[PDB]
Design a binder for this molecule. Structure first.
Ligand SMILES: [Ca+2]
Lengths: 96, 96
DNA sequence: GACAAAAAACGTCCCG
DNA sequence: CGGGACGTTTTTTGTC
């Protein structure tokens, strides 16, 4: 029957997307680290999170396309949408 | 557990993970089409969807590895786990 | 299945 | 600092 809870939904979603929680957590950590250090560039942010610059660059370009981060001459900052999303994820990620 | 915490999770997923939600929907569509037409083989199923045999064959091999479909000499059918997954995700998968 | 090729991913370096 | 890009490696795709 239709998923009644959050644990039930995630367990069903992992069948189609086995590393859903991994992607979620990695993107959440990028947004947290930008909120703490903005403006920050791809070289500093990759080093601080221990992610390869090329991988981090792809993830932040994705977040920019979703209008969550602004990528400017002096580096990256969160958008209004990014701050709001990060506040929602602080709550949700404790129950995931 | 509550409806609102689940709706919060789903709305956060739509902003942070739309690339992952797209993959999940395409794989969910494959399971729906198999439920309708099983047993069906990769040539007929790829034609029925708008995709190449080779792309389908990649997705179907994933679904077999997750124990959601069985591949027999007469084509593909859903497992028990596949039928269950379609009932659990049915409503969320329309509200995306 | 095989066999080939194209596309994607990735690690660095290039510049102003 | 980011956009652009080159060379290499890996994964996906076409074809039958
Ligand atoms: Ca059973």
């Amino acid at each position: 029957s239709n998923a009644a809870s959050m644990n039930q939904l995630i367990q069903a979603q992992k069948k189609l997307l086995p590393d859903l929680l991994l992607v979620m957590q990695k993107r959440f950590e990028i947004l947290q680290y930008i909120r703490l250090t903005e403006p920050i560039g791809r070289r500093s942010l990759s080093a601080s999170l221990g992610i390869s610059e090329r991988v981090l660059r792809g993830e932040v370009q994705f977040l920019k396309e979703q209008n969550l981060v602004d990528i400017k001459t002096n580096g990256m900052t969160l958008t209004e949408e990014g701050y709001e999303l990060l506040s929602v994820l602080e709550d949700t990620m404790k129950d995931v």
